[PDB]
Amino acid sequence: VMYYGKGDVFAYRTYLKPLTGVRTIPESPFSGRDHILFGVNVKISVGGTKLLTSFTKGDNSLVVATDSMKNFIQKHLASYTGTTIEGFLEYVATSFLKKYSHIEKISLIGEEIPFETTFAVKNGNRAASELVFKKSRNEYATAYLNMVRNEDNTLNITEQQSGLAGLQLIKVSGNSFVGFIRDEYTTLPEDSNRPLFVYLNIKWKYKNTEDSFGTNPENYVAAEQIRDIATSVFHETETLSIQHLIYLIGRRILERFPQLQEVYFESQNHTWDKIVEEIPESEGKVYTEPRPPYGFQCFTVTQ
Amino acid sequence: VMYYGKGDVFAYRTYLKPLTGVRTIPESPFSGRDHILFGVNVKISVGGTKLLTSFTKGDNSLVVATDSMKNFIQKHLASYTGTTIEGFLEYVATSFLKKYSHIEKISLIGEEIPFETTFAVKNGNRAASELVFKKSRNEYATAYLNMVRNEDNTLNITEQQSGLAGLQLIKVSGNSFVGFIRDEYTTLPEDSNRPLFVYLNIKWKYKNTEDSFGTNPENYVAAEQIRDIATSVFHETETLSIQHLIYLIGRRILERFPQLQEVYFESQNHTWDKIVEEIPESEGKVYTEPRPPYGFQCFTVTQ
Amino acid sequence: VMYYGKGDVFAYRTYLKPLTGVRTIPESPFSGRDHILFGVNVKISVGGTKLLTSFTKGDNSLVVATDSMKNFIQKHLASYTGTTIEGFLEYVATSFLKKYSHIEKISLIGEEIPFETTFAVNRAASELVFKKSRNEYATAYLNMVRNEDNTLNITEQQSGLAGLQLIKVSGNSFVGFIRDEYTTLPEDSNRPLFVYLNIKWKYKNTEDSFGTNPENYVAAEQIRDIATSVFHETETLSIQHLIYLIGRRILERFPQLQEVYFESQNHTWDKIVEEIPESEGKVYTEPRPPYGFQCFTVTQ
Amino acid sequence: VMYYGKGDVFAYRTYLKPLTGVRTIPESPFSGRDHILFGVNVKISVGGTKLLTSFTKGDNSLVVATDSMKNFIQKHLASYTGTTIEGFLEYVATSFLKKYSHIEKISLIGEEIPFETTFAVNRAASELVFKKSRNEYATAYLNMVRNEDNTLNITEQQSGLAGLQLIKVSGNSFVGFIRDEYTTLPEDSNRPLFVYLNIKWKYKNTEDSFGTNPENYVAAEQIRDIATSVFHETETLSIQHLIYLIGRRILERFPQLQEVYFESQNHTWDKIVEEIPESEGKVYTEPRPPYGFQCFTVTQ
Ligand SMILES: O=c1[nH]c(=O)c2nn[nH]c2[nH]1
């Protein structure tokens, strides 16, 4: 293994070209992105056999300073004329390999830094502000891209993946976990109605990488839309386990977006422990946080 | 100083009585709380001279186990019939002092654990789910209450405070910071148009503590409404500093809620450093995260 | 309330004047600080009635920028000729009030950023390579005011140790507490008590905190080692009982101190396996999040 | 991909069999582990084609509950008769596949929860009181599969040290790098290089990782001390240059290792004061968030 790069390259751009012309789905009102504020956290990794002596001999002759990669990323966000994190990564990668001929491979991660709208009164009415936004520490979109230079100096994308990270969903009822193995290691009680609490990271891959860029936006799959599928399927489903849930979410995603090849899930169980099962004159209950150990599932659904 | 207690007492209740009948303000659509899910993180501190020997002699005869205070809090959330964190704290405090006659003072903090609604399709339409909610790691409401037992065994509230914590607001333009002291310690440039980024914790105190409980909900001041005042004033104001901003927010709060005695602000500056000032054929710019040191302000506005 | 300032002012100084000549105590090997690397995280807060219009009118005429406060602190760490965080805070405080006549009060916190020695090869401690520690760290607090007669006065000073996490595998009990409708906790005659400790002390004479007479300076390193020694020596009956005895020992070792203040938290593990064949050992695991805490002052 | 499991399975064992008889090296005083307190955080992941319907149909017939996996790991720490995290992982892996015939693969991570000795009073290290450390910690990884012939086989094993944060105040340069339209970084012939290191190693013979023959076990404590020694000895020309030399030294000291893998990060401070009167010292501060990193393998 041999690579190096720069992490936590935060870059905030105002007034990126808006994302419009997207194709809608029943589960989501998503219709585009205003891009008044477009925030991204970028990680860049680069490799190539010509970097060996930077490690083995301390020769920096062919070392692009990681500080310079930070400058490269932030300057290119200024000159980017597209509309997606996916397309920004392609722009950075192609530009970087064109600039640095001795680099053979580049890998990029971009993580959205999301901002939400806020209310303001003006000119007689209250409406969403075009100026004041709220930084969100909840779920966020992600993008990943790897690009290589071939022997003939052409550049090729070798992997692309989009995603939604940090989605934390609790469904208060309509979930069971029963019928699992009950042996000498089992102390979990069967539960016909638990408040299942899942953390979800959902990643998708396109059949055709061009559809990830937003250039023909009707072919773009938006993380907002993926979020809303996940919440809708969770609501619709009398869940039998997280495993059961995530497969159903993945099936719906691939049905809604035939241009996707597959969807991958990383789920975690964070379901609360129950403290009060019955409350006089109410269907309510009381729960609290569990001990630290958390279940998890990793699963791919393909077309 | 002598007290002890329990922190991070998470308690989640389903189907608390809804909060309705509130009085509206121009800055906010807030009209109440459904309370399908009501989550609170409680810290309890207790004191009293009769606790001395628990420290000086290792005598636990009069020690309420902190583990038992956790049970006390979680059981009382089950039996609570009111509609606010403020009222829940009063219920816990009065109940605890009534139960433990040797305790002379109790202090409680309650922090909302907020959940947001999500979309689901069902019966032909898409609408907010009554079952699936999204845990939010953004701003949250807070409540504080201190209660004492008097020599005659009556109980009195000695301090009450409500709040909104963790509000992170960025306004992309319409903010200046110019005219500050420029001496041998000054390297900050004057800036006539910066993207001011503030973290805000806003705390308010009522003229009459009863108005905090929600029993007559038209007198309750909701953290949601305070949030929307803050965003509206930020939008409306050509800010001259954070100091200038927070005073204006506080004035609006006290004008909208004459039943409040004062409002207190803890603000932090997290404004990004500018990297690209000019972008061809665009009003946009590029910024990035600053170094760690952060400015802050603490200020009270009173009626 | 009306004040403003700057937090997370990190400053790292190499080769500060070493702290030498400190009085040692039985419990600790501490005898000074080499100060090859001196790291401190400073927070400054300033007040004054003349700041009012910076809020009420947006007038920045009398605003020292918080960014400039950061420069002030960093430049003063370069010119500081002393040997303690406590003394550095006094230097900053006096310099700032002398510079800015419209400021009536200044509050400072300094938190050590600790670095530990490492081995380099015969093996010996390196004088160049250090290990950044995320464990316990020393702290200092100072509040200084301008009086009506233009004299400057320290109104409060406090040193401390923060982030000390100690677990004693045996020799701790918690029994005899109240058992009623809300008590589910079992009594335990031998628990592996795990405590987090923040310990703070005040001097009888604020000058002793500066280190100018090193014999009268109380080092957070020595407080740490007192706490571990007393924990080891004591068959604890509760955290309350433990911290009282720690405080008593500190005050006995440092008669120049007026008080010791404790903030403790209980993080004891849940026991899962009570008996292991042919062993005295047990298996424990992490508890649920709720944590007990205590706050207590011992006075000289 | 199809697997599931349990993370953050904390388990603390008192009085595990001590690790004795380890081979020492010049760079480290390490010679064994008392194991009065043995803390490990385990993550388990399991796979098998027969799990498919637990996803596609909601059939829990063949689901070992992740909660039960937690019980499995904790109970096996109580019955473990060995002396290393690496060996404990092998014990868990083999036991789990032997128990559950429908599981075809198991992956385990174990992360040490480290505790340091403290002083108790003559002053001496306590045998009861320990300090929880949030600094560097040892790690272990193991993957085991069931073959078509029902034999069990370890397909991957890796030990490591994580979270090592080292700063060398002088004796480091970074010069000669590419200078073009994107380069603003100044060359530096004497910088206080601050690196975070995660170091991982693989054995030629997976059995050497278990500790059964302690002479062949490579301790994370010894890797730590090699890293600090090499850092001290080397006039570094970059982090790339440093980690190569660290790797070479590790492989020279432990011929039983096949490779050493590094993940490093640059956290060097920005310099604010270049010269202080009558001192060799300087003042630095924390940089902006973006951090450089390197990843490199050295092979025997
Ligand atoms: O949904 C779940 N899947 C599982 O595998 C599991 N194990 N414990 N709880 C669980 N819940």
Ligand SMILES: O=c1[nH]c(=O)c2nn[nH]c2[nH]1
């Ligand atoms: O709004 C601000 N107030 C201040 O006091 C300040 N100081 N630096 N930047 C600042 N911004």
Ligand SMILES: O=c1[nH]c(=O)c2nn[nH]c2[nH]1
């Ligand atoms: O030392 C303790 N003091 C306490 O008050 C307490 N309460 N639960 N456990 C406890 N342990």
Ligand SMILES: O=c1[nH]c(=O)c2nn[nH]c2[nH]1
């Ligand atoms: O050691 C370093 N290697 C690098 O590649 C680099 N880039 N910026 N600074 C650096 N330091």
